[PDB]
UniProtKB/TrEMBL annotation:
One of its GO terms (biological process) is methylation. This is Methyltransferase. Gene3D superfamilies: Vaccinia Virus protein VP39. CDD domains: AdoMet_MTases. Residues 32-124 form the Methyltransferase domain. It comes from Agrobacterium fabrum (strain C58 / ATCC 33970). Keywords: Methyltransferase, Transferase.
Length: 173
């Protein structure tokens, strides 16, 4: 028979969210950048690491989701805008460094060229060697290898996620 809720249209599992938030160093003194917070399940796992709410910046395109996040997570620096336009959402880069980037934007909704460019821009705003972590659902990295720009590592696989979740991490080469 025909299954409902095909694809990835339910919130990410709490098991997956905790694993993505485990890359964070809450003792580094640097804020965290979250992309595409949605219902806030990964936001919760980020705050559970002990990040001060004012030190979490989360960029959400949907105005409906954004208005609800403001009311559910007091103190967190939510921004209503497009994560692929970091200049418009974060401002022109003038030195701000994030501890790490936690991304759940749906990479496959965008051209590969856009994904590579965004990743190259995000790695300018974290210290050399620190990660971007991305969730995806296919068998391969959602962002193709460009070894002169970044290094790809498989981070984890969570079969209890609906659908099963692959986690990838990226660092500056
Ligand atoms: N370019 C973009 N910039 C900011 N947010 C985006 C975006 N494209 C998609 N989004 C938002 O990213 C989220 C993808 S769904 C994942 C939501 C949540 N983090 C979870 O894991 O369950 C949606 O909330 C969507 O509105």
């Amino acid at each position: 028979p025909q299954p409902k809720k095909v694809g990835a249209i339910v919130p990410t599992s709490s098991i997956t969210a905790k694993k993505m938030a485990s890359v964070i160093n809450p003792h580094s003194g640097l804020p965290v950048l979250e992309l595409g917070p949605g219902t806030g399940v990964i936001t919760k796992a980020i705050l559970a690491r002990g990040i001060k709410p004012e030190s979490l910046t989360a960029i959400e395109y949907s105005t409906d989701f954004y208005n609800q996040l403001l009311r559910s997570y007091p103190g967190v620096n939510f921004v209503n805008g497009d994560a692929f336009d970091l200049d418009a959402t974060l401002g022109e880069h003038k030195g701000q460094m994030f501890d790490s980037v936690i991304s759940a934007v749906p990479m496959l909704n965008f051209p590969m060229a856009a994904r590579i460019k965004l990743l190259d821009e995000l790695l300018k705003r974290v210290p050399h060697g620190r990660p971007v972590v991305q969730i995806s659902y296919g068998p391969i990295s959602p962002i193709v290898a460009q070894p002169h720009l970044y290094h790809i590592r498989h981070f984890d696989f969570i079969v209890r996620n609906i659908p099963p979740a692959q986690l990838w991490t990226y660092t500056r080469a």
